[PDB]
Amino acid sequence: VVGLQWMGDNYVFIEGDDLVFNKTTRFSAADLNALMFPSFRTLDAGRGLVVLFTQGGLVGFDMLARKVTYLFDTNEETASLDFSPVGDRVAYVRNHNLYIARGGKLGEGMSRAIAVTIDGTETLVYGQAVHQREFGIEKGTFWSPKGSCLAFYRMDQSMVKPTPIVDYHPLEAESKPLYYPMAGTPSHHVTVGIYHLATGKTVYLQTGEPKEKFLTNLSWSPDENILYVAEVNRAQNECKVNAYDAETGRFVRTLFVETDKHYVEPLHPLTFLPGSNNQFIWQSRRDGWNHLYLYDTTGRLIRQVTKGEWEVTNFAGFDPKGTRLYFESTEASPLERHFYCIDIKGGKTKDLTPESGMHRTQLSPDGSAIIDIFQSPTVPRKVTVTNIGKGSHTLLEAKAMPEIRTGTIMAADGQTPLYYKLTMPLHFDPAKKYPVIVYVYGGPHAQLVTKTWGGWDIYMAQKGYAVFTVDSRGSANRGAAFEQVIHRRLGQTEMADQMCGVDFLKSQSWVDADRIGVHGWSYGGFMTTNLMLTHGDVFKVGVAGGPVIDWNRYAIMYGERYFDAPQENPEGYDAANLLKRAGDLKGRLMLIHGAIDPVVVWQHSLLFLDACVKARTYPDYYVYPSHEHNVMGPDRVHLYETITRYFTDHL
Amino acid sequence: VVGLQWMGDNYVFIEGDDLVFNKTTRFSAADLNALMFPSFRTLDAGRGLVVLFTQGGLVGFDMLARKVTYLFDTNEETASLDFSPVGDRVAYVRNHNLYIARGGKLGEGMSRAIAVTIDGTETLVYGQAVHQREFGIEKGTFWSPKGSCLAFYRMDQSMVKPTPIVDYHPLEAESKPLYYPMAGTPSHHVTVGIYHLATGKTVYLQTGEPKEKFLTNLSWSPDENILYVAEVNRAQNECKVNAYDAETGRFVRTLFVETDKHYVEPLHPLTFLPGSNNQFIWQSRRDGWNHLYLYDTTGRLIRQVTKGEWEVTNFAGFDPKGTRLYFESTEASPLERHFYCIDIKGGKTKDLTPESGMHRTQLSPDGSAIIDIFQSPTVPRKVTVTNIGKGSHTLLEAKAMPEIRTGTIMAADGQTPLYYKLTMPLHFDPAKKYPVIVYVYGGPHAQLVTKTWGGWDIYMAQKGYAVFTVDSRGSANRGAAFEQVIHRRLGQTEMADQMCGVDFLKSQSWVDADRIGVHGWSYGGFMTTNLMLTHGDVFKVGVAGGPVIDWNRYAIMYGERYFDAPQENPEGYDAANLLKRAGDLKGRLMLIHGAIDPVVVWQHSLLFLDACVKARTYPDYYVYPSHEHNVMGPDRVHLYETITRYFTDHL
């Protein structure tokens, strides 16, 4: 059901040719083409306003009125586009600087874009994501809700020592500095500008010292008078939610402060109640579980709205009156996602999607209805549309492969339940012994085992290899205690729990205990390498892609949260520094890296090979010179074949 | 016999503790230590003047007088040291600039070095090798024979587009540009300065246009009035030997010009006859074979001194009177090296080292005697000392391993004999079938098969693998016709001849024709890869180290000699461009590269892996991040084990 979404009070989808509306009407590509089924980006679901990407600029389109809105000329920039909530202007970044282009109405001619900044360059970045995209930061432009102002980040990274990123395709290779701030080093300096459209004036927030402070979750007041910022200290154990005057940039007040033994991690903006300039919802994991908190703008906590030993995983919004909250959570089970209603006064949740498994739900603009997309181990796809507190309507339902087994084991503490998935060999025979590969990630913010319906496990299984994954402690959606055990000690608990997975595998009669392998990417590449070095008698063969190898060389804003700074934690960093234990490699391990990886710099795997040379140990290697952190697109076929053949050759 | 050499009329060697002199006297490390067995560099064999490298500077020492000469302070620079023939000054390069330090006599105090240049930097190089060390160029400083002047290269490479060379060892990796001028691109601009010690004045040779001309084989007149230069054009098919006035830098005259259908390649300086400012010996391959030619300084050729279908391989010098020439050549056999005498009037050579095999010979300062070091397949080491035209005296003689077989096959023309060596499996059994690896180089200036006594072949042989090498056409010491067949067509003839080697192997009953592999480094890495892609049905497994893959990315001064320029020869370059045929890889090939390789830039192997990704083919890889073109020192053990295990795993 291509593009299933809300447009006004209609739910909408594509039929290769038509856009179909239901509350039935149909809008074809030729109907549309006459007014200039293609791709679009929805800008305003309530109004069904979208933008169409065409040869020769952007065309805004009102799908409810069936009328062109505006033509935009952004000099071919698309990545950084951020349309005003008014819908008639768009911000974007081009050749280092921030611009605003105004939409032009059909046959009324165009105006030249406004340059918000003029001194952007390699070490001075405007209007883009900062702080290595930590703290929920995905972009660097933030329109005020009435379109009067454009707030934006200014990142001076001139003090950061860069890493070369080399393009090998020109005749002579060309390097460009990547200002990647490594653990324990000087951070970049971010400030927040606000460009006022009426006056063309810019003011900077007076965020003050230390200049390294992290400026996160920018959130405008509904009346546009105040810009709120969640400021996080370098230690990452204090978050202050502060109000700044949008007119002058002056500090107004600190609403509240959160602190934690290990770390605080704000990830979501303040969300104001409907029709209110004075009350908002703030997400916080302060009580050990991510919950919704109701605050007024003086900083006074009215009440914790949600509570329980489960986590809110998506805040979807309010009823029109702002007396109810809608949200996705783990309340039913950490392996599941359901959509709920709760009174703003708190109390009992009501599960609006009760069936056991994974629900992905979209609340209608008017808050009256939901689109639900469901899948489970027995149900490939069930698409429903429901009038909340009324009838439900099914729109679509779907109905030798490797067998997938699931269950629970105890973690190394002997108390915490861990959930696993096991992809069995194709045509598995219980009388036979099989090799098995532990596919591991194990890092924060991910959860690999859910009650659901990129298939590398199935490919391995088709080659006669079982694939086992377990979500060890450190992993997500199980509360802060379950995650924070890793603090200052990366790899230690994670590997202990992965070895409980191995204990379970060895308890299976059909497992060949002498043919156990391991594979993972990124944090999973760190884990793969660490497991081979630490448990060299168990793990015969592994493949580690884009692996972290020396945490001192990972980015400040992620690494120092989980590990603290290298100066504060030499014992922990040293224990996880795989360069120090390269002489423990006694099996077959291939490392793979994208050469232009700006997340885990190529240096990590290169230094490991260098360490292995000195240590006289013998890893294998592959480099994708055109790829960044992950191998994307058709080349992923080459990746899977390289990884698979390594295991079929050696394990 | 450590350090065997001439000092005055004595032959000399070390005995761990003593320096022993014979014409017998002995000089111990304690005798020497009292005057301040250690290492030294001999500066003047006739006078037995040496330099000793010590903590706190250089100490010049007269071994015949047993006296310190001078103390030198070169601010710890050692690589670029070039001592004046007078022995009391030394030139060197430090922080981009050329200096001359004067020696200080014991207890007479020291003087500050003189700065010859002051504006050296990354794009302006002084006193170093230029033209990528082609044309016999090994250094960039050239003292006049009486020490009155210091000539030096100035290389402006500001027009060359650089390649990043990345040091991965700092916390954040650090790149430095390498001004490596690739085939068909703008070359660097070399001029020659002459610093006059008496006046402190510098003059530049008026070498003129084109500024890209190659300035080679700088050779001072004995009277210091003229500096001769062999100038080579960009096409490399014309060499002009020109005289310049040392006082003014003005052009004086062109002595003679050499031209060739394919290429001219001057490799040696003019060597003046003893006591003569008017006659010199010039080496030239103009008649198809490297020979010695007698010229006067007007440019008039007196006579070709040596001639024949063999090559002079080392010119050792003259009798004191300058009526005879001494030299090493292939006259006995291209597989052998003997030392000869010939009258300056020419005619018959006399072989002074008649025994069949490899002789390495040192003519005494007075030209009366020779030290000879001999080895052959039956003789590991025989060291002789002979009074020419008188008695000879033996000083030393040396006396399950893999069997080494040698023989001849016909090249692909069916006419030219090729010589091969075959290292048999350890404990070879004629009833058994064995895998075999062709170890290939095949490029110009090398000859791998000689009648002699780094052992990778023996290691492979010990693992049960035969190793076969054949010197295909293109290879050295067989005359110009045998080499120049490759011109404009790199890889084509070489591979045709290597396939004659395969034909020979397949004719052996003990060869397993389905288990043939190939290995080589550099040009041999190009050949390994090319053979796998071209003859994929034959070569099952290969390992290619520091391989050339795209000749457009090799250095101008070597590549354009053998291949012409890419614009002049698209058909030839395209045929050898292994990036275009990466989809033909159907066996197992590991490429290996030193990351900081300044000879074959790392880009070659990286782009091949990138080509294989697009082509969906599957090479393997290893990178030595701390190594340049070859893996040197203890790490070479790791290299051999990586290469060997690849073959034992897959072939």
Ligand SMILES: *[B]([O])([O])[C]1[C][C][C]N1C(=O)[C]([N]C(=O)[C]([C])[N])[C]([C])[C][C]
């Ligand atoms: B990996 O697992 O993809 C990589 C190494 C460990 C963390 N990591 C990430 O990509 C994380 N993002 C960041 O580090 C951002 C770029 N700062 C992901 C997994 C989100 C936590």
Ligand SMILES: *[B]([O])([O])[C]1[C][C][C]N1C(=O)[C]([N]C(=O)[C]([C])[N])[C]([C])[C][C]
């Ligand atoms: B290799 O075979 O080591 C490399 C690639 C082909 C030629 N080559 C060389 O190292 C040659 N020297 C140069 O290219 C110099 C550095 N310009 C050697 C073999 C001498 C001919």
